[PDB]
Design a protein around this ligand. Structure first.
Ligand SMILES: NC(=[NH2+])NCCC[C@@H]1NC(=O)[C@H]2CCCN2C1=O
Ligand SMILES: NC(=[NH2+])NCCC[C@@H]1NC(=O)[C@H]2CCCN2C1=O
Ligand SMILES: [Ca+2]
Ligand SMILES: [Ca+2]
Ligand SMILES: [Ca+2]
Ligand SMILES: [Ca+2]
Lengths: 198, 198
């Protein structure tokens, strides 16, 4: 298996100085996936947003460190459950090749605890998608159980054929908060994509 | 793990006398899932339809028999790729219970060969969904590679918590043809759902 490079794959940029601090602007390498217009252009804390968070020693919200490095990438939706889905997207330069198995892996985090009166109990559900063009080739919609305060690795696989309709289209990755329950913040880290062509 | 009963779980009803024959009406136990209005009420062969098919000895379209029994359940969409998704749905009497792991398994078939000038080469993609009410709790969107002429088992899992928003809602199953490529017929068989509550 050969790795396909992913920009800002660990959400390590921007660098953060203080544990549990966070940015509220889309991290470099990624764009905001927002089909239901839940995330504003002008960002503020306490409203729907995305960014990075420093999950380091002494974090109050996990029983572990970030899966990789210092930071995680998060999507927080304050709208009520059922309002839509949102998250991160990254379109790669690599294109879909025939007779190839693609393996997309990402760690998904269930924030625990409470912050200034807002409980982090509960989890909104996640979906990890592998795209070619605008088509979702394969996705893991919420199959893993993630305990409060831990991360778990999601794996998504797709195998192309020699006559796949989407051959030559750009590969893409989406990391989605399903907003199916509250607390509706969701963390991701350590994105990896491999191929095993013939 | 305790099995939850599923009506017409193997698509064995109606009974079929001739290998490779098929019905074009929704099988009992299931309804037609058709969010994009691709499947007509008045059914004809050669247009979008669903039904059962007898995959028995001497079948021309598989290198194996039906996963279970005589028949499979199919969804055939003749619209072009990208037109929408359709399939089967079944709403169960069982309701979502707290602190329970649900395991949904179904065999998915990739029809092979050709029939009267129409090639069965290619595969449209599948999605298997576990529902509570109208919410997709978990789904396997097309993660398995299925060779031409075989079936493979898809597994979908969901673990509920003690305060799940959808507790007490009816469980449901959807079996979906993604219409992401042609040939855009898709087979299913041997649906099973288990729970492992505390
Ligand atoms: N997901 C993390 N580990 N840390 C950052 C969370 C930031 C995210 N966005 C916000 O505006 C804050 C408000 C309170 C809860 N928040 C969130 O969940
Ligand atoms: N899926 C099976 N194993 N058998 C039945 C297929 C029936 C399904 N519906 C139809 O009207 C026929 C037309 C030709 C191709 N068909 C299909 O794929
Ligand atoms: Ca990281
Ligand atoms: Ca939580
Ligand atoms: Ca059967
Ligand atoms: Ca086929």
């Amino acid at each position: 298996a050969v790795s396909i490079p992913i920009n800002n794959a660990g959400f390590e940029n921007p660098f953060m100085d203080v544990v549990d601090d966070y940015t509220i602007d889309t991290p470099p390498g990624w764009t905001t996936y927002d089909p239901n217009n839940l995330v504003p252009e002008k960002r503020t804390t306490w409203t729907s947003n995305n960014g990075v968070g420093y999950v380091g020693p002494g974090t109050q919200f996990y029983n572990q460190l970030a899966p990789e490095g210092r930071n995680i990438g998060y999507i927080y939706l304050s709208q009520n459950p059922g309002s839509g889905v949102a998250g991160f997207e990254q379109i790669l330069d690599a294109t879909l090749e025939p007779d190839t198995k693609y393996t997309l892996t990402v760690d998904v985090g269930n924030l625990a605890g409470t912050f200034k009166g807002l409980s982090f109990a509960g989890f909104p559900g996640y979906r990890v998608e592998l795209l070619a063009g605008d088509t979702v080739l394969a996705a893991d919609h919420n199959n893993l159980f993630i305990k409060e305060g831990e991360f778990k690795t999601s794996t998504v696989t797709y195998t192309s054929t020699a006559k796949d309709l989407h051959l030559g289209q750009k590969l893409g990755i989406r990391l989605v908060n399903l907003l199916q329950d509250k607390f509706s913040g969701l963390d991701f880290d350590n994105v990896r994509l491999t191929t095993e062509p013939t």
